[PDB]
mmCIF file of all heavy atoms in Angstrom:
data_model
loop_
_atom_site.group_PDB
_atom_site.id
_atom_site.type_symbol
_atom_site.label_atom_id
_atom_site.label_comp_id
_atom_site.label_asym_id
_atom_site.label_seq_id
_atom_site.Cartn_x
_atom_site.Cartn_y
_atom_site.Cartn_z
ATOM 1 N N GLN A 21 19.935 5.460 -5.165
ATOM 2 C CA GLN A 21 19.523 6.831 -4.790
ATOM 3 C C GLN A 21 19.699 7.869 -5.950
ATOM 4 O O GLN A 21 18.911 8.793 -6.043
ATOM 5 C CB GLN A 21 20.235 7.307 -3.547
ATOM 6 C CG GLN A 21 21.698 7.723 -3.717
ATOM 7 C CD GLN A 21 22.504 7.697 -2.402
ATOM 8 O OE1 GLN A 21 23.588 7.164 -2.349
ATOM 9 N NE2 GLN A 21 21.970 8.304 -1.331
ATOM 10 N N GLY A 318 57.486 20.497 -22.225
ATOM 11 C CA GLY A 318 57.144 20.102 -23.603
ATOM 12 C C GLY A 318 58.217 20.359 -24.598
ATOM 13 O O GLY A 318 59.098 21.205 -24.413
ATOM 14 N N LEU A 369 57.411 33.160 -30.971
ATOM 15 C CA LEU A 369 57.115 34.514 -30.529
ATOM 16 C C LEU A 369 56.872 35.536 -31.646
ATOM 17 O O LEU A 369 56.189 36.510 -31.405
ATOM 18 C CB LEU A 369 58.102 35.038 -29.502
ATOM 19 C CG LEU A 369 58.087 34.387 -28.143
ATOM 20 C CD1 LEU A 369 59.366 34.730 -27.357
ATOM 21 C CD2 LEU A 369 56.905 34.780 -27.321
ATOM 22 N N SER A 398 43.167 34.118 -25.139
ATOM 23 C CA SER A 398 41.743 34.494 -25.141
ATOM 24 C C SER A 398 41.103 34.600 -26.518
ATOM 25 O O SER A 398 39.995 34.173 -26.734
ATOM 26 C CB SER A 398 41.575 35.849 -24.388
ATOM 27 O OG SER A 398 41.999 35.782 -23.034
#
Side-chain angles (χ1 to χ4, degrees):
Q21 74 200 135
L369 289 165
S398 297

